[PDB]
Design an enzyme around this catalytic site. Structure first.
Site, PDB file in Angstrom:
ATOM      1  N   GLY A 279       0.902  -1.334   0.099  1.00 48.80           N
ATOM      2  CA  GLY A 279      -0.215  -0.029   0.401  1.00 48.80           C
ATOM      3  C   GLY A 279       0.908   0.918   0.009  1.00 48.80           C
ATOM      4  O   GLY A 279       2.099   1.240   0.169  1.00 48.80           O
ATOM      5  N   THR A 280      -0.219   2.365   0.411  1.00 49.20           N
ATOM      6  CA  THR A 280       0.927   3.379   0.263  1.00 49.20           C
ATOM      7  C   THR A 280       1.850   3.876   2.082  1.00 49.20           C
ATOM      8  O   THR A 280       1.751   3.410   2.600  1.00 49.20           O
ATOM      9  CB  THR A 280      -0.116   4.878   0.414  1.00 49.20           C
ATOM     10  OG1 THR A 280      -0.527   4.924   1.216  1.00 49.20           O
ATOM     11  CG2 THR A 280      -0.415   4.834  -1.650  1.00 49.20           C
ATOM     12  N   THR A 281       2.976   4.759   1.526  1.00 42.62           N
ATOM     13  CA  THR A 281       3.540   4.876   2.481  1.00 42.62           C
ATOM     14  C   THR A 281       2.392   5.797   3.523  1.00 42.62           C
ATOM     15  O   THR A 281       2.143   7.364   3.578  1.00 42.62           O
ATOM     16  CB  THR A 281       4.320   5.739   2.246  1.00 42.62           C
ATOM     17  OG1 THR A 281       5.670   4.583   2.263  1.00 42.62           O
ATOM     18  CG2 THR A 281       5.628   5.976   4.041  1.00 42.62           C
TER      19      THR A 281
ATOM     20  N   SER B  18      -4.128   2.920   4.663  1.00 42.79           N
ATOM     21  CA  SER B  18      -3.663   2.123   3.229  1.00 42.79           C
ATOM     22  C   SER B  18      -3.563   0.557   3.644  1.00 42.79           C
ATOM     23  O   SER B  18      -3.740   0.059   4.438  1.00 42.79           O
ATOM     24  CB  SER B  18      -1.587   1.855   3.652  1.00 42.79           C
ATOM     25  OG  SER B  18      -1.103   3.691   4.009  1.00 42.79           O
TER      26      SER B  18
END
Lengths: 249, 236, 242, 204, 231, 244, 226, 241
Positions: free
Chosen positions: C28-30, C73
């Site tokens: 996922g995203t940070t 995320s």
């Protein structure tokens, strides 16, 4: 969702419902317990095993009360019995204390409990319980009775019987000691002597649970002054008393 | 529970339909022939073993109305449920709508029981094929239908379902006309008898004959009545 | 074997379906969260997969209550549903007790919920880690919630591909201020370590979003960072990494 | 109005010594029309006898209710239900209905074959175990009966002294009730055999 | 048959595989392309007949005079979502005397699909929507994935050969945003965008279906000899 | 999953036959024999237990014989445990008929109902059927004495004499050769005992292994009195027929 | 009726009468109005009779369960709490006027409970229709920290006053003394203050002094062999 | 086979699925020790904080179910909060309907039944946590009850939990064999805390800090927790003995 409403009891391709046979095996992995029926009482006995030496066998209950005059004791799985004794009490109350009012006949109650066993071999999301119960009791109608409830959901009256890992040896023991007329005291001696051979630990009276459904005792009811009404015919023997009994074998 | 027992087969089929039709093969055998003035539903009775009372062995032909009957081929356990359900629908029509039922009404009703348990999951359909026969009231035309556990119905004017339906069918090809039924009741009865003596066998023991004539005339004929016809058939 | 449901268990003492769900958020995203003295500052990396997108329109920061920030995320639809349930919880508490739910109370409830779907083969677990916090009368709180149903107190937390890059800097930041630090200054920090966790996302490009809940500026409500403050932070992080 | 007092009906019962007796009138009417001069209100399950008073339809509906239950007891335990346990059953089954409750009074009379003793008990609309070892009455002319019974009764009667008594009490109450009258029947209940005797009574 | 026969089982790759399969319905399926300015939004859909004796199938559904959706995947899956969006939009008019907003209707839809993929025995919906609308915030153009996730763009595509259409829209990106007040230009540019998605599927005057919504324009679907104003 | 732990147990086989029913008949052949014979004065039900142990009490065991109502009793062959549920359903169905029609239930109706339950288990729910076979002794006023046998599939078939449980083949043939339609209760009492001694799972048939019961029309007025004999009366009749 | 309950330091005493009236008609000369929720928890009931009896049956089962689960003496307030909730949602359409007494290892206790679901405490309470007459006599003689014997008396006398000034109170006075750390002592017919006066002649008649129409025999003793 | 994947018996009569539940409480490396004092019950337990970035004040293995009953949990933390919640609801339940606070004994029995119910279904995963309930009751006196995943429970003089709990058990057993009673005599609960720490240090072979311990004390009618400062006070008193 709910897609578990297919029974988990099935037949084998060689006949014989396989699930209740496995559940009957768990009783031979279980503790030994026995009941000797006298002609003026019934005695039931079991051994206490724990997984710790710091465990309390003083808050451990393998002989439990259903109604004052009727007791139960298992062999098999602990957890299974722990919920099952509560369901036995619950149907006895909802169908014979709110409908018929008084404490049920022994024969009646045994039938009712066997129905719950049956209904764990019918439905999905449930497989049956893997204990066998001895339900000892007395009613004033059919007299003293000792019954055995199966993990199949059947019942049988016995003259004397055992369940647990040492059941086969125990009924052979009871063959020669048994007689159609017994006293309650003599029954205690026979019961504990058979269970000494079905325990491979040390055999104390602190670690052996004894109970009689023998003599009435009024002061355990909670009141006195009407003798037409009694207290419990069940009476659990405290530890020091059982020690006296070890000497009486 | 909703885990299907009806699951699409790689042939555009359903496993439970195919099995149902297998169970109809393996089971009892019913022949239906309609005259110009009657329906005859004859079905295999199971009494082959010795010392049986046949008033308390399952009814293989059950009257739903005063002039509509239901016969079956296939299993003997799956079929009783449908008999009971057919009766209710007949009584319902008569309560809320009026008018003794038509044969067609009940034909579609039985097929509508088959469709539910096929298309739904968590259930399997009956392995029962049925001969629905009888009359519409105020009409003197007799009507012969078959329904099968697929949920399809088709009209016929002679039919057979059950064990060795190929054999029974071929006999009726030379001795039956599609466009000229029998004009006499006794000949319809005797033709149904002659077909049942192929597969079933062993006298008139396992033979049944139910006759429905118009004016709301239902009679069941016991086996001893059928003996007499059989001897004429053999002599001929 | 033991990889076909979430109510098998292995002799190893491990549930792999559940463990496997943490890997979902690992792709996922940070996203980071700095626990402050006055509040919390969240920041989330928003990956740019084309230039047809409209930046700061694609929300991952949803507010739950009028004072709890939530940013997540992992698998996006799943996380939006987790927040969906939590808004119902917020209203229910308000209805019965007539006060906005506390920060620890909300953390509790979400843990129960994520527990439920790993106990039945009839519901599917989630695939998100969520980071949420705020200010209440017990102080500022910060929590990270695994898809296993685990949370703890957090001085600083992160997740995503660059959770390693983020956490390494947060250790040094407690060295810089062993007394914790102000929310207002942590905005500039928040940008800094997303740029540092974009060195694991250095074959892509990114949009920076920042959100804050602090008692010393916004009166203890969860709001967005935007405008002049936002571009100061963007400029700060750039020059440092250059 | 009140549904109990439409048809009427009285039941009288008296203990003796190692015997009981229960008796009823045969009159069942609707309101001022007398409908039937041939109907009993006394039923039996086992050897316990149930007389029921009050509203007509509930007399018959409870008759059937208890027939289901007492069959269960029997087939199970292979014998007849005891008067005491039948008491408990009656109480609970009345309480099942609370909205549109029962508008009757049942009377339980039997002999306990466990200690040899007479047992009777009474009930009204919803329950209330009425314990006595004297007599229990119920129905619409329960007052007429209560007075008559007290005066004639003496503790401990032999089965025939008992016949005399309960009969007198029933007659005069039934002819001083407008909703009773038409004939009467008395079961004198011993524990080996029961005699059922109809009374000749004014037609009224 | 471990993770591909169940719709309840993860997956150490942090997936559900069914969603990828449901995204392959879009490759086999039809193509539609949306693009917006700041004042109008436009959908250009490639209609497709079943054979040549068949009328070409409509691919745009009107949800309200400020809202429309278009499918590119399975039609029976689209039938559930069209009903749901209309229901929620009418609910917004009834209760709040409001238009329903574009972003918000996407959010409602997302969490709807999610709890039918959660429930075992369910399915993820395999149709991808472009949801356009004009609300107070101006135009909006959402891309709706089979995952359910919603993304906001100025121009987007899905279906077979949608990749080339995004190249085309990224190049003309700054052109069609700085045209305002003329919906016409956008439609011409949209025709060019879906021509980067042909495979000899040609664009005719009965293959082309246009839909617009404006500030002053209702939701209107152009079809017939009235799409030949932009050819 | 949930379809991952079901292999499908209650579908048809490729001969149109239910897996679970076919397995059930085999498990009922494990269980003890029970024979029913119909005399023109009665019906005899006679059952041999499937358990006999070292110190099993069988002197009061009423574990095969059950009164469903005061004119219908059953003999049980199969799982005693499985049988329980249907035994009490039957009690309820019977009492219901009496409650609403003021009349005793016909034998036909009661059996047909229980068969429906069995059919219902494989029809819906994924549930298995109870592995039971019943022999019904019943009196009605429309077919007189009726004899029935029912199987785990849910089908009923009439008989004049029939056997279930262990060793049905041997028993059935001997019954056909020896039974006449003008037998009495006396004759049938002796015929049942002889058949059970050719099918005894020990090497001898004993009074405490026998449950024996009759329904007799010798009770006054033509009423049927059901009698489940005491253990001393079974021992009494077993020395009379000259087994022991 | 009348029910008195007197709490005191060392225990509690609950006393009641045995006259059962329905209406002004006396249902029973003798009946036990002391009931058992539990073997240590006794109550008596006034108002309508069927409703008191029913609700103590219903709560007796629930408490009996609880007593088995703990395997030791049931607390009084468990019964109290459960009654209250039960009655409260009918809003007092179930007429139960109970005096609930009992002892347990957290002291002596005495409660009253009304139809609506009201509860009171006191060191003495009185309920029923004769409560009023009982009150007066109690409040003169009552002291802090009564002796058990003294308390016995005072209870019985209070019911006696009920017999003399109330028409729901009559025949016998029973007492139950419950003391902490012992068994409850059920003193049935502690004071019998009224006998049916003697009559002056016996009421026999010879047979058939009542006319009889016909007769039949009717057997229930069994069924029949041949 | 597939009698090891759902909770159905084997040809031994054994539920393997249930046995696995015990095998997961060693994976968090948390030990606890609980002894009955003279007028108190003390439970001391490990607190793992592997990082700075975990805030130590929050890392709690101690959940108050009642006012008087503490609960310390060994095993995975999701299942811990789940089990705590059920137990809290049930305690409140009983207070509402029976008019006093739920007995420790009865609460243990309750969770045992629920555990059995989670192994009665065939799609329900047993809650793998091992629960210690500590109380001072007014009828049973000082009490420890430890319930387990299978739904077996039994009372306890003392108990330990963790991967290394045999060693701890050995120590405690020997102590009660010298003293010949089932609870430690002292008379200040503070010194029972100190004693418990000494045995723990011996057992695991490691001296602990004020943030390697978290301590819970039940005295009469109450349960509370010691703060990290109070614990440091105890570690000075180790010197003072």
């Amino acid at each position: 969702t709910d897609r578990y409403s297919f029974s988990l009891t099935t037949f084998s391709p060689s006949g014989k419902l396989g699930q209740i046979d496995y559940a009957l095996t768990a009783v031979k992995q279980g503790v030994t317990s026995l009941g000797i029926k006298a002609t003026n009482g019934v005695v039931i006995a079991t051994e206490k095993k724990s997984s710790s030496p710091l465990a309390m066998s003083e808050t451990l209950s393998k002989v439990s009360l259903l109604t004052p005059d009727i007791g139960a004791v298992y062999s098999g799985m602990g957890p299974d019995y722990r919920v099952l004794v509560d369901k036995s009490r619950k149907v006895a109350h909802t169908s014979y204390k709110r409908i018929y009012g008084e404490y049920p006949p022994t024969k009646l109650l045994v039938s009712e409990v066997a129905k719950i066993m049956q209904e764990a071999t019918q439905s999905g999301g449930v497989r049956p319980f893997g204990v066998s119960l001895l339900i000892a009791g007395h009613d004033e109608f059919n007299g003293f009775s000792l019954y055995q409830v199966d993990p199949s959901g059947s019942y049988f009256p016995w003259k004397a019987t055992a369940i647990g890992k040492g059941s086969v040896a125990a009924k052979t023991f009871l063959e020669k000691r048994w007689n159609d007329e017994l006293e309650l005291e003599d029954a205690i001696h026979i019961a504990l002597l058979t269970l000494k051979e079905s325990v491979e630990g040390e055999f104390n009276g602190d670690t052996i649970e004894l109970a009689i459904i023998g003599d009435e005792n009024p002061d355990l009811l909670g009141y006195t002054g009407i003798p037409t009404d009694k207290g419990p015919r069940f009476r659990k023997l405290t530890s020091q008393e059982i020690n006296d009994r070890l000497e009486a074998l | 529970y909703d885990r299907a027992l009806s699951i699409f087969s790689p042939d555009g089929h359903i496993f439970q339909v195919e099995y149902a039709l297998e169970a109809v093969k393996r089971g009892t055998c019913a022949v239906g022939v309609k005259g110009k003035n009657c329906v005859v539903l004859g079905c295999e009775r199971r009494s082959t073993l010795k010392l049986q009372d046949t008033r308390i062995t399952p009814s293989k032909v059950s009257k739903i109305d005063s002039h509509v009957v239901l016969s079956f081929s296939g299993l003997n356990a799956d079929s009783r449920i449908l008999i009971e359900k057919a009766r209710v629908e007949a009584q319902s029509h008569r309560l809320t709508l009026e008018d003794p039922v038509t044969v067609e009404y009940l034909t579609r009703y039985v097929a509508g029981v088959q469709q539910r348990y096929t298309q739904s999951g968590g259930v399997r359909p009956f392995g029962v094929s049925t001969l629905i026969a009888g009359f519409d009231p105020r009409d003197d035309e007799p009507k012969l239908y078959q329904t099968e556990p697929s949920g399809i119905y088709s009209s016929w004017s002679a039919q057979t379902i059950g064990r060795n339906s190929k054999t029974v069918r071929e006999f009726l090809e030379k001795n039956y006309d599609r466009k000229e039924p029998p004009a006499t009741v006794e000949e319809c009865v005797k033709l149904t008898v002659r077909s049942l003596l192929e597969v079933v066998q062993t006298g008139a023991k396992n033979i049944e004959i139910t006759v429905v004539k118009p004016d709301s005339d239902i009679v069941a004929l016991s086996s001893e009545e059928i003996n007499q016809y059989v001897t004429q058939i053999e002599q001929e | 074997g033991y990889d076909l449901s979430n109510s098998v268990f292995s002799p190893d003492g491990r549930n792999f379906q559940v463990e496997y769900a943490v890997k979902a958020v690992e792709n996922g995203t940070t996203s980071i969260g700095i626990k402050c003295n006055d509040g919390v500052v969240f920041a989330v990396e928003k990956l740019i997969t084309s230039k047809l997108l409209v930046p700061q329109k694609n929300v991952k920061i949803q507010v739950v209550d009028r004072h709890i920030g939530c940013v997540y995320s992992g698998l996006i639809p799943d996380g939006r549903h987790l927040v969906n349930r939590g808004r119902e919880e917020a209203a229910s508490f308000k209805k019965l007790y007539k006060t906005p739910i506390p920060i620890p109370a909300f953390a509790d409830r979400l843990g129960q919920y994520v527990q439920a779907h790993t106990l039945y083969n009839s519901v599917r677990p989630f695939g998100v880690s969520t980071i949420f916090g705020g200010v209440d009368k017990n102080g500022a709180h910060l929590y990270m919630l695994e898809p296993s149903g685990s949370y703890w107190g957090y001085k600083g937390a992160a997740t995503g591909k660059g959770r390693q890059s983020a956490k390494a800097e947060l250790e040094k930041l407690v060295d810089h201020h062993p007394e914790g630090l102000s929310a207002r200054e942590a905005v500039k920090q928040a940008a800094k370590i997303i740029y540092l966790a974009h060195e694991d996302n250095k074959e892509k490009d990114f949009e920076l979003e920042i959100s804050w809940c602090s008692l010393s500026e916004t009166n203890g409500l969860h709001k967005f960072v935007k405008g002049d403050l936002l571009q100061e932070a963007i400029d700060f992080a750039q020059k440092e990494i250059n | 109005s009140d549904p109990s007092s439409i048809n009427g009906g009285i039941v009288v019962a008296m203990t003796g010594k190692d015997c009981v007796a229960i008796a009823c009138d045969l009159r069942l009417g609707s309101q001022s029309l007398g409908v039937s001069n041939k109907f009993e209100k006394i039923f039996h399950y086992g050897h316990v006898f149930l007389g029921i008073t009050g509203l007509a339809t509930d007399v018959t509906t409870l008759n059937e209710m208890f027939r289901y239950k007492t069959n269960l007891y029997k087939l199970k335990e292979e014998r007849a239900i005891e008067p005491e346990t039948f008491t408990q059953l009656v109480s609970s089954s009345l309480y099942e209905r609370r909205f549109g409750p029962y508008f009757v009074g049942p009377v339980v009379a039997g002999i306990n074959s466990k200690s040899g003793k007479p047992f009777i008990a009474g009930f009204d609309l919803i329950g209330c175990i009425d314990e006595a070892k004297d007599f229990i009455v119920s129905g619409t002319a329960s007052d007429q009966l209560f007075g008559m019974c007290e005066s004639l009764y003496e503790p401990n009667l032999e089965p025939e002294d008992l016949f005399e008594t309960i009969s007198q009490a029933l007659l005069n109450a039934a002819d001083r009730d407008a909703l009773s009258g038409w004939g009467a029947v008395v079961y004198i209940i011993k524990k080996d055999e029961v005699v059922k005797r109809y009374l000749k009574m004014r037609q009224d | 048959n471990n993770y591909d026969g169940d719709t309840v089982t993860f997956s150490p790759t942090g997936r559900l595989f069914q969603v990828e399969y449901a995204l392959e319905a879009i490759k086999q399926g039809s193509v539609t392309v949306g693009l917006r300015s700041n004042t109008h939004a436009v959908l250009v859909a490639l209609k497709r007949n079943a054979d040549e004796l068949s009328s070409y199938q409509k691919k745009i559904i009107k949800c309200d005079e400020h809202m429309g959706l278009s499918l590119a995947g399975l039609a029976p899956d689209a039938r559930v979502l069209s009903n749901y969006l209309r229901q929620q939009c009418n609910y917004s008019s009834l209760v709040f005397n409001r238009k329903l907003a574009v972003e918000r209707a996407g959010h409602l839809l997302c969490d709807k699909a999610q709890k039918n993929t959660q429930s075992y025995g369910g399915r993820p919906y395999g149709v991808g929507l472009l949801i356009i609308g004009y609300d107070k915030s101006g135009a909006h153009l959402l891309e709706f994935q089979p995952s359910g996730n919603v993304t906001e763009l100025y121009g987007t595509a899905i279906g077979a050969r949608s990749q080339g259409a995004k190249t085309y829209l990224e190049r003309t990106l700054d052109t069609f945003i700085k045209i305002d007040g003329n919906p016409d230009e956008l439609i011409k540019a949209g025709v060019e965008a879906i021509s980067q998605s042909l495979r000899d599927e040609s664009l005719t005057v009965d293959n082309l279906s246009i839909a617009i919504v404006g500030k002053d324009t209702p939701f209107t679907i152009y079809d017939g000899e009235a799409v030949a104003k932009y050819i | 999953g949930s379809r991952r732990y079901d292999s499908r147990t209650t579908i048809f086989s490729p001969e149109g036959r239910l897996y679970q029913v076919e397995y059930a008949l085999e498990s009922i052949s494990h269980a003890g024999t029970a024979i029913g014979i119909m005399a023109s004065d009665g019906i005899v039900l006679a059952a041999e237990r499937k358990v006999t142990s070292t110190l099993l009490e069988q002197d009061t065991s009423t574990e095969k014989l059950y009164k469903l109502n005061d004119k219908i009793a059953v003999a049980v062959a199969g799982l005693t445990a499985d049988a329980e549920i249907l035994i009490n359903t039957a009690r309820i169905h019977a009492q219901n008929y009496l409650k609403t029609y003021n009349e005793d239930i016909p034998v036909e109706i009661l059996v047909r109902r229980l068969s429906d339950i069995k059919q219902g288990y494989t029809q819906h729910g994924g549930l298995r059927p109870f592995g039971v076979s019943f022999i019904y002794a019943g009196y009605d006023d429309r077919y007189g004495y009726q004899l029935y046998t029912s199987n785990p599939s849910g089908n009923y078939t009439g008989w004049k004499a029939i056997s279930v449980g262990a060793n049905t083949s041997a028993a059935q043939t001997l019954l056909q050769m020896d039974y006449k339609d003008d037998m009495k209760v006396d004759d049938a009492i002796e015929l049942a005992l002889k058949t059970l001694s050719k099918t005894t799972d020990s090497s001898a048939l004993t009074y405490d292994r026998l449950e024996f019961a009759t329904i007799r029309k010798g009770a006054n007025d033509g009423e049927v009195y059901q009698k489940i004999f005491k253990p001393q009366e079974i021992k009494d009749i077993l020395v009379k027929t000259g087994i022991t | 009726t009348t029910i008195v309950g007197v709490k005191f330091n060392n225990g509690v005493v609950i006393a009641a009468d045995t006259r059962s009236t329905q209406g002004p008609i006396v249902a029973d000369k003798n009946c036990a109005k002391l009931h058992r929720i539990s073997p240590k928890i006794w109550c008596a009931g006034a108002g309508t009779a069927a409703d008191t009896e029913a609700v103590t049956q219903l709560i007796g089962s629930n408490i009996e369960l609880h007593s088995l689960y703990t395997s030791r003496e049931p607390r009084v307030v468990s019964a109290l709490q459960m009654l209250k909730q039960h009655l409260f949602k009918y809003q007092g359409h179930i007429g139960a006027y109970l005096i609930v007494a009992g002892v347990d290892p957290t002291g002596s206790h005495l409660f009253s409970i009304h139809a609506h679901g009201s509860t009171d405490v006191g060191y003495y309470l009185s309920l029923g229709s004769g409560s009023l007459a009982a009150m007066a006599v109690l409040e003169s003689h009552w002291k802090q920290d009564l002796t058990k014997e003294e308390a016995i008396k005072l209870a019985s006398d209070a019911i006696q006053a009920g017999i003399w000034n109330d028409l729901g109170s009559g025949s016998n006075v029973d007492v139950c003394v419950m003391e902490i750390g012992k068994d409850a002592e059920y003193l049935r017919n502690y004071l019998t203050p009224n006998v049916r006066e003697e009559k002056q002649k016996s009421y026999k008649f010879p047979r058939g002094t009542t006319a009889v129409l016909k007769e039949s025999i009717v057997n229930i003793c069994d069924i029949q062999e041949e | 086979g597939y009698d090891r994947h759902i909770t159905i018996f084997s040809p031994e009569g054994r539920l393997y699925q249930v046995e696995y539940a015990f095998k997961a409480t060693n994976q968090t490396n948390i030990n606890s020790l609980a002894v009955r004092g003279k007028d108190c019950t003390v439970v001391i337990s490990q607190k793992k904080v592997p990082d700075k970035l975990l805030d130590p004040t929050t890392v709690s293995y101690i959940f108050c179910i009642s006012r008087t009953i503490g609960m310390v949990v060994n095993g995975p933390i999701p299942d811990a909060r789940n089990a705590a919640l059920r137990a809290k609801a049930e305690a409140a339940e009983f207070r509402y309907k029976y008019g006093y606070d739920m007995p420790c004994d009865v609460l243990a029995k309750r969770m045992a039944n629920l555990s059995q119910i989670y192994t009665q279904r065939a799609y329900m995963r047993p809650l793998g946590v091992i629960l210690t309930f500590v109380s001072v009751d007014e009828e049973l006196g000082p009490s420890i009850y430890k319930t387990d995943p299978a739904g077996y429970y039994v009372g306890y003089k003392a108990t330990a939990t963790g991967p290394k709990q045999q060693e701890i058990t050995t120590n405690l057993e020997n102590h009660f064999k010298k003293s010949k009673i089932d609870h430690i005599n002292e008379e200040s609960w503070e010194k029972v805390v100190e004693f418990a720490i000494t045995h723990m240090i011996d057992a695991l072979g490691t001296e602990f800090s004020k943030n390697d311990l978290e301590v819970g004390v039940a005295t009469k009618d109450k349960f509370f927790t010691l703060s990290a400062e109070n614990i440091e006070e105890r570690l000075v008193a180790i010197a003072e003995q």
